[PDB]
């Protein structure tokens, strides 16, 4: 895994094909190493397989990465890092 | 009807940067991506990235992450690119086009820049 | 990247013959969610800018003649041309969508025999 904290490059944003992605800085030394992502919906309930990007990689300290997610309808919390330092970004997506 | 109307071509040196337009009509600008895409004379195509009227999202190729810049202008409902510290590699024609849920519907007849000392 | 591949690289088909040529992705381009594969084809006349011909695979682009036809699912895709027109002679490209960043195919040079 990879144990860093984690920081918002560029905020999270709909792509032009019905995706999202949000850029993520990585500040912390270990690299590289997996990316710790998990999504829940409004119920903090584990979405599952909706990490459209190859499991994700940090390359060096202070190395941004991309990460695209396939969210699902309505609310969701996106869960960057682990433990304290970790991320959670809102993202609510329309039916259209 | 759909239209994307660009420049025919651009001559510079090596070292020099370019900018280059992409003006859209006959739909509502807002409501579509625009991609940018390179081929080399002989070659095929590259995708460079995109951007989103309105929001301002843009998306780039990480192999053209330091050599292009993706802008635009609402009012004119134009799309622009930038190209820096431009090289032979750089010499290629460069369309815009339309994006609708990712296949690009609509293209301009591109921009073919020459770098030459 | 997602790599995507064409074969053949080029063939010459006569006026009225049928046609297939194939594009094969490095990863499947299926979004189970509702089952759309992220894939497009489109022809490169001479001279001239790219041309949507078929999108999400197997769906015609508006205003494409129904003798353009797009199959296949997961990463094996083909564009099947029937009764081959005199004009058609381009480089057709396949390209996917299915995530940053786009790649095309190196494409197949459509030549006419007469």
């Known amino acids: 895994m990879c144990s860093g904290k984690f920081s918002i490059d560029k905020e999270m944003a709909e792509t032009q094909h019905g995706t999202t992605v949000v850029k993520v800085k990585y500040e912390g030394a270990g690299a590289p190493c997996k990316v710790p992502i998990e999504i829940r919906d409004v119920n903090k309930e584990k979405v599952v397989g909706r990490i459209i990007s190859s499991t994700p990689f940090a390359e060096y300290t202070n190395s941004v990465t991309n990460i695209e997610l396939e969210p699902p309808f309505g609310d969701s919390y996106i869960v960057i890092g682990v433990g304290d330092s970790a991320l959670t970004l809102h993202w609510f997506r329309k039916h259209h | 009807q759909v239209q994307l109307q660009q420049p025919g071509a651009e001559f510079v040196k090596p070292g020099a940067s370019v900018k280059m337009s992409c003006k859209a009509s006959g739909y509502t600008f807002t409501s579509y991506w625009i991609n940018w895409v390179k081929q080399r004379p002989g070659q095929g195509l590259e995708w460079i990235g995109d951007?989103?009227?309105?929001?301002?999202?843009?998306n780039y190729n990480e192999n053209f992450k330091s050599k292009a810049t993706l802008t635009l202008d609402t009012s004119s409902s134009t799309a622009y690119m930038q190209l820096s510290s431009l090289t032979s590699e750089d010499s290629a024609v460069y369309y815009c086009?339309?994006?609708?849920?990712?296949?690009?519907?609509?293209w301009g007849q591109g921009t073919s820049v020459t770098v030459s000392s | 990247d997602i790599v995507m591949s064409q074969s053949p690289s080029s063939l010459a088909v006569s006026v009225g013959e049928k046609v297939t040529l194939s594009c094969k992705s490095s990863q499947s381009l299926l979004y189970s969610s509702n089952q759309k594969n992220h894939l497009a084809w489109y022809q490169q006349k001479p001279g001239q800018s790219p041309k949507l011909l078929i999108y999400?695979?197997?769906t015609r682009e508006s205003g494409v003649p129904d003798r353009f036809t797009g199959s296949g699912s997961g990463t094996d895709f083909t564009l099947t041309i029937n009764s081959v027109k005199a004009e058609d002679l381009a480089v057709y490209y396949c390209?996917?969508?299915?995530?940053?960043?786009?790649?095309f195919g190196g494409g197949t040079k459509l030549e006419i025999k007469r």
């Open positions: 390209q996917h969508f299915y995530i940053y960043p786009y790649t």
């Open positions: 999400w695979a197997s």
């Open positions: 951007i989103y009227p309105g929001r301002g999202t843009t």
């Open positions: 086009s339309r994006g609708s849920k990712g296949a690009m519907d609509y």
